[PDB]
Amino acid sequence: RFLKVKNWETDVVLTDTLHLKSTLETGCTEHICMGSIMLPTKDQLFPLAKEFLDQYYSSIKRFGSKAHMDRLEEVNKEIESTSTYQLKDTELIYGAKHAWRNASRCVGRIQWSKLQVFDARDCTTAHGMFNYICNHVKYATNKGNLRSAITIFPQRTDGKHDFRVWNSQLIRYAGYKQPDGSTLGDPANVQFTEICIQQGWKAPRGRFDVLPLLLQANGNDPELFQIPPELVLEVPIRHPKFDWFKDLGLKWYGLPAVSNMLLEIGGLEFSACPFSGWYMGTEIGVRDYCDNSRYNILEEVAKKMDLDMRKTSSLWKDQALVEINIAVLYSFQSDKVTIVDHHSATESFIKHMENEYRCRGGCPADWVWIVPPMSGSITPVFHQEMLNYRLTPSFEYQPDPWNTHVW
Amino acid sequence: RFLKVKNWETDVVLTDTLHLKSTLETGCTEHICMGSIMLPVRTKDQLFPLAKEFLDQYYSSIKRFGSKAHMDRLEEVNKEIESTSTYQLKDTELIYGAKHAWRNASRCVGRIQWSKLQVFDARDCTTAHGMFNYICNHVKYATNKGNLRSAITIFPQRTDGKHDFRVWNSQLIRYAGYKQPDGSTLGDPANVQFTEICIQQGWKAPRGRFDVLPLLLQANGNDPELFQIPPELVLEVPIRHPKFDWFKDLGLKWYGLPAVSNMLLEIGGLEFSACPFSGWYMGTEIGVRDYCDNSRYNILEEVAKKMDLDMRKTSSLWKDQALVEINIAVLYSFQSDKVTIVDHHSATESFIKHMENEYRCRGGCPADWVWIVPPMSGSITPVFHQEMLNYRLTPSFEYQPDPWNTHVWKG
Ligand code: HEM
Ligand code: HEM
Ligand SMILES: N=C(Nc1cccc(CCc2cccc(NC(=N)c3cccs3)c2)c1)c1cccs1
Ligand SMILES: N=C(Nc1cccc(CCc2cccc(NC(=N)c3cccs3)c2)c1)c1cccs1
Ligand SMILES: C[C@H](O)[C@H](O)[C@H]1CNc2nc(N)[nH]c(=O)c2N1
Ligand SMILES: C[C@H](O)[C@H](O)[C@H]1CNc2nc(N)[nH]c(=O)c2N1
Ligand SMILES: [Zn+2]
């Protein structure tokens, strides 16, 4: 009932009570743990609404005040009538920040309360979504000094009128397979990269071609738009010692901006809610470059380093991996674009876990995702027991829209 | 019910049915995951069922399910239980049981090797001296002059819980740790407490950085006794680096034989509380954890200074660079002395193949991602992108409390 979590490096023991407010399900059972699986009516809505409003008013110390009871009634009225309701701005801001605060997979949550929220609930067309996205991008980029933000498009009504950003992130690199049979640019996007052409895009057939945005307003077919290059900050990747590094030709964008998730506040579903902050370096250096099914440049970097690539036990992959990541961090820092290393991000997150244990009685956290993909055991999160549970408001996955849209 | 796991690097999907044979609890529920939590006397009552499940498994494996031999064994074990409140395993049953505990160990990356396990039956042992002899023969056989072979030695089972066999050591071979007055630590900080107990029981500590601890052995619920392992039995490897000649001057060495001596082996409801087992090291267990954990030898700073890395900013990744070098050194040193060791790329690759094999022939492989993924270079090894199902099958290896916490001293 009152669960404990221990840090094995520091012996620090925290006590979790916040999980008892857990609402949704994890996929795990008494018999089976699924911690490593990527994805395991008017009736429904009022409980959900009341729950959320209860935590709102408690957060502003007006639980059981007149306004609270008045609101619960106003929303109760609005639901019994319209079959949905609308959030006040203040509630929207609290909801979004809290969906980030509750993302158990995010190592970056020490920053949860400094989130800029752009209310795009008055938007009606793809051109309009495009304007809102551009302003989001520009605000967030801030000439390199990145600022967290989210833009919230209109809430789903009856599932026929959905706003969706078809891009999985706002800013990503094109991928094309060749007759040769291998891959140019980023293989993650091959499919999307073809949809875009399959709808109209004139691909500059290249390696790092920023993809066009593909936007669907109010359930309608979606439309192509190029984000103005001037708005897409990029960083040429070079090493502080290896001059040949530059000649690998590598660059990356500074703004990670997730665009395919669904935000749930008080039972209301926001299917287009792109959000952005900034990178931890290993997301680019370990996952984007070195994954077998991504840019997969380890072989190439290893060779230029003249390492003994003959036997796994020379650890040539690991050597190359570290230099690549030093390179990415060096570049971003040199160009004054915000970025965080994994040692610093994990130290931050331990600090935040501690803050959330005392101020709030816990912090849902998913170890499988919080431990970085390199140097795990020399970062402090490795030695930290964590409890994973689902609280609301939350961000959730949702099916790729091309599997669902009728034309 | 069938459950699927996918690999995201290769799109290979597998189907689990074995999880249906599971019964023990995970720690998790529908509302909470405890997947990253380190640790989430029986009556006739519960013993009968547990012995029957075990025997049904045993006789299916040998293709004799429902034979007269099966049925008589059941009847024999049942009489023995209601007669004496316990039973004895046949040799063949013990062998199968020990191997399957290994096979069912969801946190073990080395399981491709499960069927080649040498089992020593030490169930006639009655004293600590006899335990010392068995452990010595285990160590020498396992070591095999550097060409390591997996083995386990199984001492008598628990009876009333007042006559337990225990090895108080956490592993058969480990270095002492000594808390110095100035706050620092000499040798391995993980072993300070155990080192104090030993000293208290009368061990004269040489008080250097790599002193092999004595064995501390309890037979039959007696107070345990000290024994020094013969040093000619303890294979050690000096740690050098193939390019950095200053590495050897750091003074590092490590032992070759990892042999865990503090787990509890559960077979058909019986509890073997002393069951030391041994295999061979994955390099990262020495190079990442043993040397570079902050709560262990923690040589990272010293190695970084000698490499003259930029240590002013973590974003230099100076910790990450030094860590790869220390692990290169460890693998180089072991290979050069022809002492079996496996790197994490090779171990994890082998495990993915074991795992697919186990899905095909067995219907599953319970696996604990948190422990299988290596503590460096996680995502450039194939297990990182492997979805895994974790559940508890028996026979199994279980944790058990430290004996200094539970023991009734006699004096
Ligand atoms: C401010 C800097 C931020 C840093 C450095 C950061 C870092 C991270 C990292 C490293 C991951 C794992 C990502 C992966 O491997 O794909 C992650 C996941 C996540 N982050 Fe944060 N984050 C930040 C801001 C935010 C913001 C502003 C939001 C929401 C408003 C957010 C919501 C999430 C969610 C929902 C996931 C998991 C999504 C999934 O399950 O795939 N993050 N973040
Ligand atoms: C043959 C070579 C072997 C290799 C390379 C191997 C590798 C590993 C590694 C790397 C771990 C994680 C250890 C840690 O993080 O501290 C592990 C855990 C484990 N292994 Fe294996 N292993 C091997 C043989 C065996 C044998 C022979 C047994 C038993 C007969 C076994 C039973 C286990 C158990 C029970 C754990 C988990 C311990 C715990 O939960 O604390 N291993 N093994
Ligand atoms: N189920 C999947 N999920 C999936 C696939 C790719 C990426 C992601 C998550 C991307 C993500 C989400 C949130 C944060 C980050 N990284 C960041 N630093 C931020 C992005 C926005 C604010 S911070 C990346 C999730 C798939 C795997 C393979 C095909 S689909
Ligand atoms: N709960 C703990 N248990 C614990 C503590 C230290 C080590 C271990 C596991 C030791 C182990 C177990 C099984 C295999 C291995 N490594 C091997 N290569 C083998 C050892 C024996 C056969 S193979 C190591 C478990 C702690 C963690 C940190 C501090 S206490
Ligand atoms: C199968 C496995 O769960 C999958 O590889 C996960 C592991 N941990 C991860 N962790 C993060 N941060 N991001 C990821 O994409 C993944 N992938
Ligand atoms: C809290 C967490 O479970 C703990 O640090 C685990 C993580 N993964 C591990 N994995 C292995 N192989 N060995 C370990 O000791 C640990 N420690
Ligand atoms: Zn779980």
Domains of chain B: 16-123+150-160+264-278+348-372 (3.90.340.10), 124-149+164-235+399-403 (3.90.440.10), 236-258+281-346 (3.90.1230.10)
- Do the beta carbons of residue A342 and residue A281 sit within 8 Å? yes
**DSSP E strand boundaries for B58-144:** 118-121
**Cα dihedral A333/A336/A342/A347 (nearest 10):** 120
Report the separation in Å between the CA atom of A208 and the middle of ligand 7, taken as the mean of its atom positions: 39
Sheet holding A213-216, edge to edge: A164-165, A213-216, A223-225
A302's CB contacts (< 8 A; 6+ apart) are: A309, A316, A317, A319, A320
Looking only at the bridges linking them, the beta strands covering B151-154 and B118-121 are parallel
What single string gives the DSSP state of each residue in A249-313?
Answer: --EEES--EE-S-EEEETTEEES---EE---BHHIIIIIITTSTTTT--HHHHHHHTT--TTSGG
Q: How many helices (H) and strands (E) does chain B have?
A: 12, 18
CA angle A185, A186, A189 (to 5 degrees): 125
Ligand 4 atom nearest residue B190's Cα: 29
Q: Taking a contact as any Cβ pair under 8 Å apart, which residues of chain A between 364 and 383 contact chain B?
A: 366-368, 371-378, 382
Alpha carbon B13 to its chain centroid, in Å, reads: 29
- Do the beta carbons of residue A163 and residue A218 sit within 8 Å? yes
Question: Residue A191: which region, alpha, beta or left (left: phi > 0; alpha: psi -120 to 50)?
Answer: alpha
Six token digits for residue A265: 């506040």
A349's CB contacts (< 8 A; 6+ apart) are: A107, A108, A109, A110, A370, A381
Find residue B6's DSSP bridge partners: B13
Sort out which chain B residues have CB atoms less than 8 A from A25's CB and list them: 30-31
Please count the residues of chain B: 411
- Do the beta carbons of residue B16 and residue B3 sit within 8 Å? yes
Backbone discontinuities in chain A, residue before each (C to N > 2.5 A): 40
Residue B354's CB is within 10 A of a number of other CB atoms, namely: 20
A406's CB contacts (< 8 A; 6+ apart) are: none
Considering CB atoms only, which of A9, A25, A373 is closest to B30?
A: A25
* Cα separation, B144 vs A269, whole angstroms: 64
* Cα separation, A48 vs A53, whole angstroms: 9
Amino acid at B226: L
A62's CB contacts (< 8 A; 6+ apart) are: A68
Residue B387: C-alpha distances to residues A36, A236, A269, B13, B368 (Å): 5, 34, 29, 9, 10
- Do the beta carbons of residue B279 and residue B173 sit within 8 Å? no
- Do the beta carbons of residue A326 and residue A245 sit within 8 Å? no
Kindly state if the Cβ of B401 falls inside 6 Å of ligand 4. Answer: no
Return the residue matching tokens 């040949």: A244
DSSP, collapsed to helix, strand or coil, labels residue B32 as coil
* Cα separation, A116 vs A92, whole angstroms: 11
Six token digits for residue B186: 């000499």
In 3D space, the residue among B212, B118, B227 whose CA is nearest the CA of residue B167 turns out to be B227
Residue A182: C-alpha distances to residues A127, A176, A177, A295, B280 (Å): 36, 9, 6, 12, 40
Report long-range pairs for B237-246 (Cβ below 8 Å, ≥24 apart). B237/B333, B237/B334, B237/B337, B237/B339, B238/B333, B239/B329, B239/B330, B239/B333, B240/B329, B240/B332, B240/B333, B240/B336, B241/B325, B241/B328, B241/B329, B241/B332, B242/B328, B242/B329, B242/B332, B244/B306, B244/B307, B244/B325, B244/B329, B246/B306
In 3D space, the residue among B47, B54, B56 whose CA is nearest the CA of residue B78 turns out to be B47
In 3D space, the residue among A393, A399, A333, A407 whose CA is nearest the CA of residue A54 turns out to be A393
Angle between helices A316-334 and B318-336 (to 10 degrees): 170
* Cα separation, A132 vs A163, whole angstroms: 13
Residue B298's CB is within 10 A of a number of other CB atoms, namely: 14
In 3D space, the residue among A122, A125, A129, A98 whose CA is nearest the CA of residue A112 turns out to be A98
Residue A159: C-alpha distances to residues A43, A162, A268 (Å): 17, 6, 12
* Cα separation, B334 vs B26, whole angstroms: 37
Residue A295's CB is within 10 A of a number of other CB atoms, namely: 23
CA angle B7, A100, A333 (to 5 degrees): 80
Element (H, E) at B15: strand B13-16
* Cα separation, B154 vs B277, whole angstroms: 9
- Do the beta carbons of residue A123 and residue A163 sit within 8 Å? yes
B38's CB contacts (< 8 A; 6+ apart) are: A6, A8, A385
Resolution in A: 2.3
Q: Is the dihedral of CA B97, B98, B100, B106 positive or negative?
A: positive
**Cα dihedral A279/A207/A214/A152 (nearest 10):** 10
Return the residue matching tokens 């293989």: A187
In 3D space, the residue among B249, B248, B254, B244 whose CA is nearest the CA of residue B187 turns out to be B254
Alpha carbon B380 to its chain centroid, in Å, reads: 25
- Do the beta carbons of residue A338 and residue A254 sit within 8 Å? yes
Six token digits for residue A91: 């509630």
A43's CB contacts (< 8 A; 6+ apart) are: none
Residue A109 catalytic?
yes
In 3D space, the residue among A138, A129, A140, A150 whose CA is nearest the CA of residue A224 turns out to be A129
- Do the beta carbons of residue A148 and residue A276 sit within 8 Å? yes
In 3D space, the residue among A350, A274, A379, A291 whose CA is nearest the CA of residue A107 turns out to be A350
Residue B99's CB is within 10 A of a number of other CB atoms, namely: 19
Residue A177's CB is within 10 A of a number of other CB atoms, namely: 13
Q: How many A-B residue pairs are in contact by the CB < 8 A criterion? A: 203
**Residue in chain B nearest A377 by alpha carbon:** B375
Element (H, E) at A129: helix A126-141
CB-neighbour burial class of residue A123 (10 A; exposed 0-12, middle 13-18, buried 19+): buried
- The preferred substitution site among B38, B262, B289 for testing ligand 6, maximizing ligand atoms within 8 Å of CB, is B38
Sort out which chain A residues have CB atoms less than 8 A from B324's CB and list them: 315, 318-319, 322
Q: What's the gap in Å between the CA of B76 and the closest CA on chain A?
A: 32
**DSSP E strand boundaries for B234-302:** 236-238, 253-255, 259-260, 264-267, 270-272, 277-278, 281-282
Return the residue matching tokens 């009847």: B75
In 3D space, the residue among B338, B272, B285 whose CA is nearest the CA of residue B119 turns out to be B272
A36's CB contacts (< 8 A; 6+ apart) are: A368, B35, B369, B370, B386, B387, B388, B390
B283 — contact with chain A (CB < 8 Å)?
yes
- Do the beta carbons of residue B366 and residue B392 sit within 8 Å? yes
A228's CB contacts (< 8 A; 6+ apart) are: A134
- The preferred substitution site among B193, B260, B294, B344 for testing ligand 4, maximizing ligand atoms within 8 Å of CB, is B260
A374 and B378 within 8 Å at the Cβ level: the answer is yes
DSSP, collapsed to helix, strand or coil, labels residue A323 as helix
Residue A345 sits at φ, ψ, to 5 deg, of: -60, -45
What single string gives the DSSP state of each residue in B226-241?
Answer: EEPPPGGG--EEE---
Radius of gyration of chain B (CA): 23
A35 and B35 within 8 Å at the Cβ level: the answer is yes
Q: Which ligand is nearest to the CA of B384?
A: 5
Residue A167 sits at φ, ψ, to 5 deg, of: -60, 145
- The answer to whether the annotation marks B244 as part of a ligand binding site is no
Terminal Cα distance for chain A, rounded: 50
